[PDB]
């Protein structure tokens, strides 16, 4: 048997228990992260089961996530991060940037998955920032496998997002700030059993951009997004 | 053979999986929160005419503003109980403040994924604890209660119940419920609940109840102080 | 017989056997190469087999002897991985030797700390014995010629003439010929009789680019590999 | 790393070890030993298995041990397991003297000896030692003081034991022909002589299967000697001599 | 200094098949009496005898340590120790501790159970033994001996004349000395017997 | 059960580490990556392959710059791969520090390889799952290309084609003679190879990523400009008709 | 590494790993040691399968110190361990002692650590069988160690592949008032019941300790005993 | 070192290794304990007497302190392990505070050692359920009890060992006030328990008795004889009533 342990290469080059975590990213509550010209944009779900948790984090004023996974390792890696970013505040005087981060939380992944008695982390990342080179958006797996991505979401039946999204692909880099985010809401609005509708005590979203420092909205702020609805 | 560490095909650990099962063999406890206070009750299953009720302790404090119900395994909660009230004190000591009830159950909930035979285990940690606890306190915005399950995923809630009989009782307890109640009506409901799922009777020593409320520091009720509001 | 994990392993069966290394021995027959030694009254030669399928190759950094000192040789078999490991580890050994000793290390004291090494595997389960040979040629002030071979059982002798790889039984077979009708062996009957029972083993009538030759010679203790122009002389010397 | 472990410390679905009682049915073929306690001494017996053309007498003994001025053992084993164990009494033993500057009293040389090889059935992974014993000796305490032990850490006093082969014949057979306070170190060894051949499967002893020593306080200073082949042989003429009066 | 914080006088010497040695009994610390009955000489095994002297302390620590090693020997192979084989142990057994020693000047004096042939040793702070056959000191008096044994000693010498010998040396070695007195005793080896005495000496 | 191939610490019968032949197959089920040399430098190729069209070219890099003169092209898991990068960076940058100059490659492909390979023995860790390239330019050692398996092999070749197209790739460059072009007439061939090799039926489309190193750059190792990348594609376009 | 014993005690009592060792020293090399008053012998034998082996290089009686011989019946590559050991040990026990050390406390320390390496962690044990001779204040000492720790003083005993044929055989020879001239014959004609074909010099190896130190013989000298 | 997971969760929580643990004692030798008014009484029994052996060295009644004694129904070599640690941290206790130690505090000590060795990496658990008893400040006896998983609660009068459940059955029916009135009375109530699980008379008894300020005792055979003769006659009465 194969599929026990994380140091056993399957007869056709598989990891079992890579894709056994990656298939804990496919029952948790969706999210969705899209990029534009000027600024960043996240949110969620927050699937309440009569209280659940809370969906996103601030890492510092110019990077936050968003979980899709196990809540408990993610608080491990969000701890990571904010210590990285202080240490290179601390050190060199300047916010650390956003790729050489990623980078950094790969390389963290990637140990457990080539030694005995470990379990790799069951839990998927999606992060917004900005710096010189304008926003940022950036997808993280259980494996250390990071991208690059102008729009995407994860969760369960996060397909009809994904298709509406390279569907809308074409309009985003000019839509101003409200508009993202109503393209955002109205495309995270298919992922639902067509039984439901979008409310202010689900939602949850976070924003970015040169001119403010990652901004979340509660419940009770959420409302002025939610005008201009259809079937 | 298997591992401690090892997934399912689900993305579901096993350890954790197998041992929430554990918390179904339990006794009940409900805790509910107001306007103005929570509430902590709980049951004791008695097994024999000798032994000395006295000594079960279910519900322990952490602080002078908050407090902690426990079901399933009464042996592994007794090395998180303390943590917390480490912590506690600690946070008094560099910072001449109160800790939050959110902070409390992250600090213990921070606990209980650290188990695996890779390192070299000084700590020991073999194996996750099978308990569910029920915190509560006052803090600097109003009365908190929460929940938390051996994965360390705690959550916030108003009345909650958990235990062997937790799945229709929390039902009637999702009936019973109205932002404005008050203390007194709550107290009455659980004791009800608890009356209509135990098994033996309702007696004023098969209980422990206490109340955070604020003003006051925690408190535990007396033998007295308890059948003054069971004849109804 | 068998009776638990005494297959998977390094322990004891029934009958007294180690079969992890009983299987370790037939890796050097996946590389399907063949290497040979020998030796006269003032010299040491050892000989192997190249081969080159692609034509897309730089045929510079495709060779099985190595330079463990400049007054010693080596050549291995077997796997390719798992013989550079051994040749760092001698190269090793013998600078320590010669910074703490004063002198230089003899083939003796190599081929017995590699052997040690080698054995040490052979005991524990954590890790399994490495799938190569080492045999290696030097000269010395006494004795003169030395020859030397390791296995991936802890075993170490010295030989007069000795073979290894995937035809080992053939060619010694053949070897054990000649030396009982021995002569002078000094320069032209070492190189010419090893190439000769490569041919009579394999019966390709071999060419100037698929083979390695390495000297040393008393008057030239230096290790040497050779030049094409070289092995061309003797191609069509021994070719009358 | 999972597939080739046995645990080896493991409570067995019935609350008992295996590999505890598992030696203990090894201990039942090794070499039969037998010890008594008399109002003057002390004696203990043993029986030899190995009969060839040996350098015997090399040593003080094959079987006999000893610990301190007033102190021995009498393993009945295995060897290799045994000869640490007498190390680590010794080691004690000297250490308690350096400390305190006094004998070692029996019992605390016995417990901290049954606490070595409880870790071996609890922590560690190793299979545990397979040799129980039966030490002798003096003290200003109690007197004449034997003992016992066992492979699980567990030990007990007693009046008279036999341990090995056939021991459960010898203490049956023992328990009646054993009077209390009325016995002396001239007919605990006749006790010996026959219980040893009562039990024995050799139709009878030839002083060459056979082993005993004594051990007394003469003069203040405390005697272990061992009987030489004209003494023995002596004593199981007698034992021959008196069996014939029947 | 550290060495003489109390003091101490240690002596021996060899005849023609019996050795002596010798030692005084006083205890106290760098001016002061306390006690007139302290034991400096061992015995490590049967004819074979080891004096300390310097730090009392070390002085006892050395013999329960040596007593240890000792018994340890002797219950591994069963065999009497041999003087040359103590010597060398000591040796080691001092020399563990260059950086952070004792401050003892042990002196070996015995036999061989297999010629009776005299031996006497003296080592040092570190363990440079000196083997010799005239006779061995140790201690503070070392001087105030020496240039007496020089004088009276003879090769070949019976038992009595050794035993007068050893005693009017040290005696009037002491008297010399005050930090060192108050009590000589003296032991004799034989090939099968021991004479252990004590002498008359002054208390002041 | 047979349990002969559930660890590297083990041999089957015949001989043979089938942890090693395990891993090896993942390299075969990733895209191509060629690199041949030439009398002046060095000149890399690889295919990335775009699954959906979300993703923004210029992700999933598999080209990397391990030192001034020095660069990987890799192939199978990525993750193993930057770990090596960082490896190889780590190495050089020390020796830099000892001795006092740019190392050499035979040396760094040797050291990464012995470093690849304390993974084929023991049963605590699992083999490697990438196969990499190396190459770099000299005006002493002149132009070097090595590549490295997931065993601990590194060899040296004209031109190597680690990947999924591996027969197909290295019988269409057989069809050249580098030793007598320049770094200039290389980079189209590379190109014309690259598009003849993949296939449109089973994956849709693709991105091309090219490299230098030798006299054009001077040393340095750098990416391809975005005209000489266009002249390139248009010649494979031409040709491909 | 590995932290868990992998001999165990099976449901009869009896380790049997000790056992699936010992069935190795039955083929090797069948030894031979006896006892005189003068000394001690020790006999090996050996099985070069070509010519063009060597035999100048390669030997198996090697000595410990000044007094003290080895050899062993098993294992080769599991003896040079052994070897290196006792070399160490016995340096020990001078540097101490500043004295050579005796022969039964070195077959101790052997015995402890052949037996050490029987409940350690990821081990097996050891698939040899050594005899060892030497000399100390008059008289000579023979004694022979085994795998599971346990050492006997032996007389005129032998092992290796006919060794249940080579005892009997060295019972009814042995009169215990030999001198050093004809234990030596017994010795070479024992093994001469277990050899296969013709026998000569380089086919066996000798050594011997009498009061001068412990010796091996040259070819010239087995040569000379050789012709009866 | 050794770090791998011995006890382990199960498919209904059913930590097996704990589960294995208890069914010893219930095998070992049977134990009584009672709280009387001004007295506490131990009756370990069950002892298999064979004529040969010195009652000193096996004994099974100990003492951690001149205040606390203890009784244990499983394997001795770890009880014998288990109260030299409790000893060691009494002594620990009456150092730094300036008073002795209370029943809790060494009860509490215990259990965090059993459940410590239910969670740990290369341990076993233990396979003894003692039975401790004290005397507090202010007298206030008291009777606490414990399990190799790490609980303990007070108990009036609790039994272990096998035969454990007749006795409580028989127990729970008989301790009254007005059967707890001196010394004499509590004692009686023991050995009419033990007599059920008896074989053979009272032939295997090792009573005790903790009383203010004795610190220990234990009766000889004289007066065991007496105290069955005594009871012979009342069920002789008894059953004449009958």
Excluded at chain 3, 22 to 49: H, M, P, W
Excluded at chain 8, 4 to 28: M, N
Aim: glycine fraction near 8%; charged fraction near 25%; include cysteine.
């Amino acid at each position: 048997q194969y599929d026990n342990d994380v140091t056993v290469w399957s007869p056709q080059g598989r990891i079992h228990q890579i894709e056994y975590a990656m298939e804990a990213v496919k029952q948790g509550s969706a999210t969705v992260g899209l990029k534009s010209k000027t600024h960043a944009v996240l949110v969620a779900l927050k699937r309440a089961q009569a209280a659940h948790q809370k969906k996103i984090l601030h890492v510092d004023n110019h990077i936050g996530i968003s979980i899709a996974g196990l809540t408990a390792d993610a608080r491990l890696l969000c701890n990571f991060m904010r210590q990285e970013c202080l240490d290179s505040r601390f050190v060199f005087d300047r916010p650390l940037p956003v790729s050489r981060l990623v980078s950094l939380i790969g390389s963290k992944t990637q140990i457990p998955t080539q030694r005995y008695g470990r379990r790799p982390y069951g839990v998927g990342l999606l992060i917004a920032g900005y710096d010189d080179m304008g926003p940022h958006i950036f997808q993280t797996c259980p494996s250390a496998n990071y991208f690059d991505c102008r729009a995407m979401s994860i969760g369960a039946r996060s397909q009809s997002a994904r298709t509406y999204l390279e569907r809308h692909m074409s309009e985003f880099m000019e839509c101003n700030l409200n508009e993202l985010v109503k393209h955002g809401l109205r495309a995270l609005r298919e992922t639902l059993p067509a039984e439901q509708d979008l409310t202010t005590k689900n939602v949850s979203i976070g924003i970015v951009g040169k001119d403010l420092e990652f901004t979340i909205y509660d419940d009770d702020d959420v409302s002025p997004f939610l005008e201009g609805l259809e079937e | 053979d298997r591992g401690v560490n090892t997934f399912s095909p689900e993305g579901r650990l096993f350890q954790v999986e197998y041992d929430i099962e554990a918390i179904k063999l339990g006794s009940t406890a409900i805790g509910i929160q107001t306007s103005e206070g929570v509430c902590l009750a709980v049951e004791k299953r008695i097994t024999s005419p000798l032994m000395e009720p006295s000594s079960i302790e279910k519900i322990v404090e952490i602080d002078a503003h908050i407090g902690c119900a426990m079901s399933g395994l009464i042996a592994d909660a007794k090395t998180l109980i303390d943590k917390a009230r480490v912590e506690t004190q600690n946070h008094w000591f560099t910072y001449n403040e109160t800790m939050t009830v959110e902070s409390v159950t992250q600090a213990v909930s921070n606990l209980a994924l650290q188990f695996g035979e890779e390192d070299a285990d000084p700590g020991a940690m073999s194996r996750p604890f099978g308990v569910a606890l029920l915190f509560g306190g006052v803090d600097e915005k109003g009365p908190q209660l929460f929940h938390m399950d051996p994965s360390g995923t705690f959550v916030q809630c108003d009345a909650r119940a958990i235990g062997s009989a937790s799945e229709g009782a929390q039902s009637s307890l999702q009936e019973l419920y109205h932002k404005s109640m008050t203390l007194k009506e709550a107290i009455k409901s659980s004791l009800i609940i608890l009356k209509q799922v135990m098994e033996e009777k309702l007696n004023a020593t098969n209980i422990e109840l206490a109340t955070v409320q604020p003003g006051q520091n925690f408190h535990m009720f007396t033998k007295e102080e308890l059948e003054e509001v069971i004849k109804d | 017989s068998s009776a638990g994990f005494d297959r998977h392993i390094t322990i004891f069966s029934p009958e007294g056997r180690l079969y992890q290394v009983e299987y370790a021995f037939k890796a050097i027959n996946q590389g399907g190469l063949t290497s040979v030694a020998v030796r006269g009254k003032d010299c040491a030669v050892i000989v192997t087999q190249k081969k080159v399928p692609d034509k897309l190759l730089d045929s510079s950094t495709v060779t099985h002897l190595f330079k463990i000192t400049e007054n010693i040789g080596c050549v291995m078999t077997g796997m390719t991985a798992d013989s550079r490991s051994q040749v760092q580890r001698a190269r090793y050994e013998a600078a320590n030797w010669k910074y703490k000793y004063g002198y230089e290390i003899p083939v003796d004291m190599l081929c017995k700390r590699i052997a040690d090494i080698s054995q040490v595997y052979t005991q524990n389960a954590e890790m399994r014995p490495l799938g190569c040979c080492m045999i290696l040629i030097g000269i010395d002030e006494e004795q003169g010629p030395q020859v030397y071979k390791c296995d991936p059982a802890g075993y170490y002798c010295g030989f007069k003439a000795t073979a290894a790889g995937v035809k080992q039984t053939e060619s010694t077979s053949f070897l054990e010929k000649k030396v009982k009708k021995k002569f002078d062996w000094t320069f032209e009957q070492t190189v010419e009789t090893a190439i000769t029972c490569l041919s009579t083993v394999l019966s390709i009538d071999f060419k100037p680019s698929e083979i390695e030759v390495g000297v040393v010679t008393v008057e030239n203790p230096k290790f040497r590999i050779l030049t094409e122009a070289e092995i061309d002389a003797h191609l069509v010397a021994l070719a009358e | 790393s999972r597939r080739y472990d046995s645990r080896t410390t493991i409570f067995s679905p019935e609350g008992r070890l295996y590999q505890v009682e598992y030696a203990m049915e090894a201990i039942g073929h090794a070499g039969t030993c037998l010890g008594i306690l008399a109002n003057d001494g002390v004696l203990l017996a043993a029986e030899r298995r190995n009969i060839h053309k040996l350098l015997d007498e090399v040593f003080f003994s094959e079987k006999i041990y000893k610990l301190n001025e007033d102190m021995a053992c009498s393993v009945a084993g295995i060897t290799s397991d045994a000869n640490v164990l007498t190390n680590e009494l010794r080691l004690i033993a000297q250490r308690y003297l350096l400390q305190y500057q006094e004998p070692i009293p029996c019992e605390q040389l016995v417990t901290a000896l049954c606490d070595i090889k409880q870790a071996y059935t609890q922590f560690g992974g190793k299979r545990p030692f397979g040799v129980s014993l039966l030490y002798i000796g003096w003290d200003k305490h109690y007197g004449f003081q034997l003992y016992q032990s066992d492979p699980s850490g567990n030990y007990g006093g007693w009046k008279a034991t036999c341990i090995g082969n056939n021991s459960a014949a010898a203490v049956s057979m023992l328990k009646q022909d054993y009077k209390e306070g009325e016995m002396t170190l001239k007919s605990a060894l006749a006790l010996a002589i026959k219980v040893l051949n009562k039990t024995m499967d050799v139709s009878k002893l030839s002083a060459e299967k056979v082993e005993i020593a004594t051990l007394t306080r003469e003069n203040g200073k405390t005697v272990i000697r061992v009987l030489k082949q004209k003494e023995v042989e002596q004593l199981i003429k007698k034992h021959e001599e008196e069996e014939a009066k029947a | 200094s550290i060495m003489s914080y109390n003091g101490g006088a240690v002596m021996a010497m060899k005849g023609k098949n019996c050795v002596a040695i010798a030692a005084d009994r006083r205890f106290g610390i760098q001016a002061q009496l306390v006690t007139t009955d302290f034991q400096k000489i061992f015995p490590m095994g049967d004819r074979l005898y080891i004096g300390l002297a310097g730090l009392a302390t070390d002085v006892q620590t050395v013999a329960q340590r040596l007593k240890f090693r000792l018994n340890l020997y002797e219950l591994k192979e069963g065999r009497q120790i041999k003087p040359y084989t103590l010597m060398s142990m000591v040796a080691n057994l001092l020399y563990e501790k260059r950086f952070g020693p004792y401050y003892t000047e042990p002196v070996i004096a015995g036999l061989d159970p297999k010629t009776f042939k005299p031996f006497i040793c003296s080592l040092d702070l570190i363990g440079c033994p000196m083997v010799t056959d005239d006779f061995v000191v140790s201690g503070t008096c070392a001087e105030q001996m020496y240039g007496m044994c020089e004088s009276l000693w003879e090769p070949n010498m019976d038992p009595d004349h050794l035993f007068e010998t050893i005693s009017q040396a040290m005696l009037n070695a002491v008297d010399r000395d005050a930090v060192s007195g108050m009590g000589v005793i003296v032991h004799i080896i034989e090939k099968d017997k021991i004479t252990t005495r004590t002498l008359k000496a002054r208390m002041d | 059960g047979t349990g002969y191939d559930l660890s590297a610490s083990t041999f089957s019968p015949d001989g043979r580490v089938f942890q090693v032949e395990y891993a090896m197959k993942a390299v075969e089920n990733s895209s191509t990556a060629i690199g041949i040399r030439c009398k002046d430098g060095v000149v890399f190729g690889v295919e990335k392959l775009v699954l959906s069209k979300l993703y923004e070219e210029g992700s999933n890099k598999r080209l990397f710059n391990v030192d001034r003169h020095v660069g990987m092209a890799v192939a199978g898991l990525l993750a193993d791969a930057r770990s090596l990068a960082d490896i190889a960076r780590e190495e050089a940058s020390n020796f830099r520090s000892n001795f006092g100059y740019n190392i050499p490659l035979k040396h760094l492909a040797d050291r990464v390889a012995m470093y690849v390979h304390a993974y084929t023995l023991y049963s605590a860790v699992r083999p490697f799952g990438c196969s990499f390239m190396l190459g770099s330019y000299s005006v002493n050692d002149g132009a070097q290309l090595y590549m490295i398996d997931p065993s601990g092999v590194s060899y040296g070749y004209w031109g190597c084609a680690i990947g999924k197209a591996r027969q197909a790739a290295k019988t269409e460059i057989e069809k050249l003679q580098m030793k007598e072009m320049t770094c200039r007439d290389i980079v189209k061939e590379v190109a014309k190879i690259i598009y003849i090799v993949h296939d449109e039926v089973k994956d849709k489309a693709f991105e091309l990523e090219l490299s230098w190193v030798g006299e054009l750059t001077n040393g340095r190792h750098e990416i391809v400009p975005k005209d000489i990348r266009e002249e390139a594609e248009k010649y494979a376009k031409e040709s491909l008709k | 590494g590995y932290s868990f014993s992998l001999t165990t005690f099976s449901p009869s009592g009896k380790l049997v790993q000790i056992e699936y060792a010992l069935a190795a020293v039955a083929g090797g090399a069948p030894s031979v040691g006896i006892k005189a008053a003068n000394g001690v012998v020790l006999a090996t034998e050996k099985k070069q399968k070509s010519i063009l082996y060597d035999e100048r290089s390669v030997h198996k009686v090697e000595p410990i110190t000044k007094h003290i011989g080895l050899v062993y019946s098993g294992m080769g590559p599991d003896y040079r361990v052994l070897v290196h050991r006792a070399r160490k040990l016995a340096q020990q026990y001078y540097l101490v002692y500043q004295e050579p050390i005796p022969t039964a406390q070195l077959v101790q320390r052997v015995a402890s650590v052949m037996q050490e390496y029987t409940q350690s962690g990821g081990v097996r044990p050891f698939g040899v069988s050594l005899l060892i001779c030497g000399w100390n204040e008059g008289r000579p000492y023979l004694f022979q160690s085994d795998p599971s720790g346990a050492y006997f003083a032996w007389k005129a005993t032998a092992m290796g592949k006919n060794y249940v044929n080579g005892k009997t055989f060295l019972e009814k020879r042995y009169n215990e008032d030999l001198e050093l001239e004809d234990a030596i014959h017994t010795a070479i004609l024992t093994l001469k019941e277990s050899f296969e074909g013709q026998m000569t010099e380089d086919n066996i190896e000798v050594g011997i300790c009498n009061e001068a130190g412990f010796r091996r013989l040259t070819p010239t000298e087995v040569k000379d005993y050789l012709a009866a | 070192s050794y770090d791998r997971a011995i006890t382990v969760f199960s498919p209904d929580g059913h930590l097996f290794q704990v589960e294995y643990a208890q069914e010893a004692v219930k095998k070992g030798s049977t134990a009584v304990g009672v709280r009387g008014r001004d007295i506490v009484v131990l009756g370990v029994e069950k002892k298999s007497v064979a004529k040969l052996q010195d009652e000193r060295t096996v004994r099974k009644i100990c003492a951690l302190d001149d205040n606390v004694c203890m009784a244990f129904a499983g394997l001795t070599a770890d009880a014998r392990i288990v109260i030299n640690r409790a000893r060691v941290e009494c002594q620990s206790h009456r150092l730094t505070v300036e008073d002795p130690v209370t029943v809790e505090y060494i009860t509490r000590y215990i259990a965090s050692l059993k459940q410590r060795y239910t969670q740990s990496n290369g341990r076993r658990p233990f396979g003894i359920s003692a039975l401790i008893v004290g005397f507090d400040f202010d007298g206030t006896p008291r009777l606490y009890q414990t399990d190799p998983s790490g609980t303990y609660h007070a108990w009036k009068a609790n039994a272990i060992g096998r035969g454990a459940k007749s006795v409580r059955e028989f127990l729970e029916k008989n301790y009254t006030d007005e059967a707890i009135e001196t010394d004499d009375l509590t004692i009686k109530l023991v050995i009419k328990a033990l007599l059920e699980v008896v074989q053979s008379g009272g032939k295997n008894i090792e009573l005790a008795v903790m009383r203010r300020d004795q610190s220990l005792k234990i009766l000889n055979p004289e007066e065991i004889e007496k105290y069955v003769a005594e009871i012979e006659k009342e069920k002789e009465e008894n059953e004449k009533k009958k």
